[PDB]
């Protein structure tokens, strides 16, 4: 059978055989209903190209009628050329099989018996046949390979899935949340080296169309379509369709000199013909193509199973959101598409970016940063318009062609719109292809619709609508449209008339914005200029939009599900500003903050840094010196980040979900060095970017004084401006000259000798190594401690407590179940190891592998709640088979075998928790509740919203809110823990093991001399921990939901929930409320505390 296909490939077919054994014929069979179309091919490299080579042959391949009409002459032609390069990187491929047989005389030493076919660097001899003396590959393997390798060369930028936490922390060793700005784009914009072979070896395997045998070692399983991915890859590198560029932590981490290697393919141009239907390959070879889009009525299928955890089952409730959100349709919106073609990606760029492209005017490290971002924007870019292209063909009005998007849960619970270079995570796509849509009556300025359309423009020019009543924010947009913008609409009204730009469109957009500028900026000067021009101004049809967003979403659904003890008032006040109003029915957001609290959680826990800091600042009043660094410090950090508060708010930046407030990455458990790392890393950013200020203005303006054009926005006069200078450059030079150091548990001050000095060069201006060290503990002991200090008070010592047992326990799982099935890998391969037809480097089969999954059963790897999955330890990491799986044929580009398996979980239980069933199941139920609101786009924390819909299905969202605050992550995780603990064995971990879980559930003094009795004895206290926050979880949502609650956390625009609790606690003080709240608590305890006698 598979023999009969493949008859002279080199070897036996037989793994119990004297002499060179054919792993490829012994790891895969072939499939009962045919895959690939190239299966029984003698060059498929040329059948393909003849199926591609006119509509009528790729219709006769495919068993079409009609074949797709984007497949016209223009797109045949480069299709033809596609082919042709083919041709020439299945030439370089065998030329370098050839050097490799005739280097060191492998192949000699192979046609003699050598089992060179079972080296990490010769697993791809299982696919070649004799010639004569030597070998060559089996011309239909090979063709087929390149037909793969092309596909993955036109669609892998796109089709790359976005890295999610543990990869990029895997792939740095740092939370992707305290990485350098710049970087975070790059590893979001390129590939590693195990990223791009994977895929590309995926599409190998795929269309090579075989099925892996089960009992088949991986190592050639996985090994034989990694391998000539690699050869692949190093073809392309070759050819330079593929570009290697390499990163460092440098701005991060001196002390790591570890480097990263991405590799990026190049980009063909936007308006390239093939862009328009870029898988006539994928759709010729596969009889089901994986890639393609879904117009009309095609709608992608509900995915079985959890993003990156082949063994979590997205449950039935996770199925019918993703069935909801795949359901929706999303449509053109011309206008902006027309915009964006005109505008052009280079002043695209220009506009979002430094205002300009010539790295001569620009600071080295910013001109560094824009990088990634830069090629992600050019990427949304091209990808955006092979969309277009593609609907274009599918009908001559774009605007009525239907596009659905694929999504699947992620390893949180999140819903994730596949692909990169969607609406969901591009902001550039995002203005262009939309599922909101609404008809407004905007005759008169006073209509409901008015108000809408004029609050979805506000916030898109960044106005903080859920700051303000209606009014106001009705104000304060009349002034920008009569002021600042008034340029840039006029610029647009013209443009919808003449279809053209000035030549200084970005100097018109850049001053008229501001700091305002965004994508979703230019889709609200652009529809006020329709609407302004419209003939009918009473049903004025737009897809301007206003977003439902949370408030400091992360730390307020932390407080309201995490949080065990009595009630305080410190917490009802600080809740609040969450949106969770207690006794005041009907209150908004909009009117608690300019009515009642302007202070969000962010600004509470920066006053709260501030008042430990001033603790601080007394206990070393008398020393002097202190007082000036921490003087230096908070005024270096006032002229470059004023508002600390980061978050994903780059015009250039994809959106990904990532919390990346301080508040909220300490509460998740971020370590306090990274975090100090992480804010130095901001306030250095926002150097370099003033650096290529003062640049930008030498150049227009030579007039202009170095110390004004550097600080000309904190300074109107001159003596002012070089007061900054002198500042700036004080601080510097004493933050790195001295540190702080804390010696027998005071802090004292240093020299490093190496403070920095000297005429500052903006061009080239870097602080890095011992600099930039000095300025993180300056940091760390006088900014990021303090802070630490201040959230307890903020979020209130209770939630904290609460997140501290959840961490510890989750950790404590995940050891162990890291470590069972580490030992039963490792006791397989020593029985594999007495097998003779085995031999190490093969590692274990897939059924070998799935049993061991399996054993780890009674340990409760995942929390199942019963609406959603979690499996906290869920990983792919290379730590477990620990040997490398392949490497091209120069033995480079080694790939490390990666494995599905649990591992270590450290601090992620926090966040994983918190956002799974926090905002995830708030969008979760938004999708699937009675009356769910249609054609929205959700994103994690915030949701967008068509103007007719605007106050309901915030309503609804708010529901949202609070039947997630009717959940308990704290109970979920105790359930999974005490099955844990009632099969656990902890005399059966290894010492490795033992002393992380020691680390978790011991204090420092009982951990060197702590017996496995004793860590037992804790791990079963910390069980007891749960249980009882648990219950106070519970008792404090019953009687919160007996209250009369007004929940706006999904603000904006004004409609919060009422759950009509009838024990009226208004007119009361947040003390009084507390006291009530906690005698209802105390009867409730009480009354449960019954039950259970009974």
């Known amino acids: 059978g598979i023999d009969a296909v493949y008859p002279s490939l080199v070897g036996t077919a037989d793994s119990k055989a004297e002499g060179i054994k054919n792993y490829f014929k012994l790891s895969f069979t072939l499939p009962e209903e045919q895959k690939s179309r190239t299966v029984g091919s003698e060059a498929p490299l040329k059948d393909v190209a003849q199926a591609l080579s006119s509509r009528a042959r790729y219709e006769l391949f495919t068993e079409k009628e009609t074949a797709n009409p984007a497949f016209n002459g223009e797109v045949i032609k480069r299709y033809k050329e596609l082919m042709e390069h083919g041709e020439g990187i299945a030439d370089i491929l065998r030329s370098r099989l050839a050097k490799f047989l005739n280097t060191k005389d492998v192949g000699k030493r192979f046609a003699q018996g050598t089992e060179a076919n079972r080296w990490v660097g010769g697993k791809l001899l299982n696919i070649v046949e004799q010639d004569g003396d030597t070998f060559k590959y089996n011309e239909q393997l ?188 999303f449509y053109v919106h011309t206008p902006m598409v027309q915009f964006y073609e005109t505008l052009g990606k280079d002043r695209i760029l220009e506009l979002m970016g430094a205002g300009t492209l010539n790295k001569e005017l620009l600071n080295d490290n910013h001109a560094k940063s824009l990088e990634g971002k830069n090629r992600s924007v050019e990427d949304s870019y091209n990808q955006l318009f092979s969309v277009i292209e593609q609907v274009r063909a599918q009908s001559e009005d774009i605007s009525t062609v239907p596009i659905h998007y694929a999504y699947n849960m992620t390893r949180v619970g999140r819903m994730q719109m596949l692909g990169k270079y969607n609406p969901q995570s591009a902001k550039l796509v995002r203005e262009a292809i939309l599922p909101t849509k609404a008809t407004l009556d905007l005759s008169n300025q006073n209509n409901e619709d008015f108000s809408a359309f004029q609050l979805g423009l506000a916030q898109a020019l960044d106005i903080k609508v859920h700051t303000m009543t209606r009014e106001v924010m009705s104000d304060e947009l009349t002034k920008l449209l009569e002021g600042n913008l008034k340029p840039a609409i006029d610029m647009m009204v013209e443009f919808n008339t003449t279809g053209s730009l000035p030549e200084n469109a970005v100097d018109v957009l850049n001053t008229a914005l501001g700091d305002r500028k965004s994508f979703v900026a230019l889709m609200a000067l652009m529809e006020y200029s329709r609407y302004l021009v419209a003939e009918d101004k009473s049903a004025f049809v737009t897809p301007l939009y206003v977003e439902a967003d949370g408030v400091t979403n992360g730390p307020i659904n932390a407080m309201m599900l995490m949080t065990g003890g009595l009630f305080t008032p410190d917490w009802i006040r600080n809740i609040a500003k969450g949106g969770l109003f207690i006794g005041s029915p009907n209150k908004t957001m909009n009117e608690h903050r300019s009515t009642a609290d302007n202070n969000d959680l962010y600004q509470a826990s920066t006053n709260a840094l501030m008042e430990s800091l001033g603790k601080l600042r007394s206990n070393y009043a008398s020393n002097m010196p202190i ?110 000259s001295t540190v702080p150091v804390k010696r027998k548990g005071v802090l004292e001050l240093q020299s490093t000798g190496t403070g920095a000095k000297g005429k500052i060069n903006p061009k080239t201006y870097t602080i890095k190594g011992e600099q ?230 011991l204090e420092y003094d009982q951990r060197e001399n702590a017996t496995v009795d004793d860590i037992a004895n804790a791990a079963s206290l910390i069980e007891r921990n749960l249980r009882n926050i648990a219950l106070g979880v519970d008792i404090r949502h019953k009687v919160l939901d007996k209250v009369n609650l007004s929940i706006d956390q999904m603000a904006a625009v004004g409609a919060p929930y009422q759950n009509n609790g009838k024990i009226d606690l208004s007119n009361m003080t947040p003390e009084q409320q507390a006291d009530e709240l906690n005698k209802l608590f105390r009867e409730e305890l009480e009354a449960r505390k019954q039950k259970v006698a009974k």
């Open 627 to 736: 007082q000036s660094q921490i003087d230096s410090l908070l005024s270096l950090m006032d002229l470059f980040l004023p508002d600390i508060n980061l978050g994903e708010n780059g015009a250039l930046e994809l959106k990904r979900g990532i919390a990346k407030n301080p508040l909220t990455i300490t509460i998740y458990g971020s370590g306090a060095r990274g975090i100090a790392g992480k804010l130095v890393s901001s306030v250095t950013d926002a150097i370099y970017e003033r650096m290529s200020d003062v640049l930008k203005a030498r150049a227009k303006d030579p007039n202009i004084s170095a110390a004004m054009a550097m600080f000309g926005k904190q300074a109107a006069s001159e003596a002012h401006a070089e007061e900054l200078l002198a500042r700036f450059l004080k601080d510097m030079e004493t933050l790195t």
């Open 772 to 1001: 930039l060290k000095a300025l993180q503990e300056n940091m760390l002991h006088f900014f990021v401690e303090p802070l630490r200090n201040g959230i307890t008070q903020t979020v209130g010592e209770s939630l904290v407590y609460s997140t501290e047992q959840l961490q510890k326990a989750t950790q404590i799982q995940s050891v162990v179940l890291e470590d069972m099935f580490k030992q039963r890998v490792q006791e397989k391969l020593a029985e594999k190891a007495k097998d003779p037809t085995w031999k190490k480097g093969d590692f274990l089969t897939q059924k070998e592998l799935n049993d061991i999954q399996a054993s780890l059963n009674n340990l409760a790897p995942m929390i199942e709640t019963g609406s959603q999955t979690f499996y906290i330890a869920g990983s792919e990491n290379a730590e477990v088979a620990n040997q490398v799986l392949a490497t091209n044929l120069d033995d480079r580009m080694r790939v490390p075998m990666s494995i599905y398996a649990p591992a270590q979980a450290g601090v992620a239980g926090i966040p994983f928790m918190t956002i799974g069933t926090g905002d995830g199941m708030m969008m979760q139920t938004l999708s699937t509740m009675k009356g769910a609101p249609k054609n929205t786009l959700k994103i994690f924390d915030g949701m967008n919203i068509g103007l007719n819909d605007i106050t309901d299905a915030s309503r609804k969202a708010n529901e949202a809110v609070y039947t997630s605050w009717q959940g308990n992550p704290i109970k979920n995780v105790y359930e999974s823990y005490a099955k844990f603990m009632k099969n656990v064995d902890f005399s059966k971990l290894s010492p490795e093991a033992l002393e992380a879980i020691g680390k978790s559930a």
């Open 142 to 329: 090979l063709q087929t390979a390149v037909l793969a390798g092309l596909q993955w060369r036109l669609t892998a930028t796109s089709n790359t899935a976005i890295k999610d936490a543990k990869d990029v922390a895997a792939i740095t060793g740092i939370d992707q949340a305290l990485l350098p700005e710049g970087l975070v784009e790059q590893f979001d914009t390129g590939m590693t080296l195990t990223e791009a072979v994977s895929s590309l070896a995926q599409k190998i395997e795929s269309y090579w169309g075989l099925s892996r045998n089960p009992n088949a070692p991986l190592g050639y399983t996985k090994g034989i379509p990694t391998a000539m991915a690699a050869e692949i890859l190093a073809a392309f590198v070759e050819s330079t369709d593929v570009v290697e560029n390499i990163v460092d932590m440098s701005e991060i981490d001196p002390d790591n000199k570890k480097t990263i290697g991405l590799y990026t393919i190049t980009e063909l141009d936007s308006f390239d013909p093939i862009n328009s239907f870029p898988t006539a390959i994928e759709e010729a070879v596969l009889v089901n193509p994986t890639e393609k889009m879904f117009f009309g009525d095609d709608i992608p299928p509900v995915a079985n199973t959890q993003l990156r955890n082949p063994a979590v089952r997205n449950t039935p409730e996770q199925k019918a959101a993703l069935k909801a959100e795949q359901a929706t349709e």
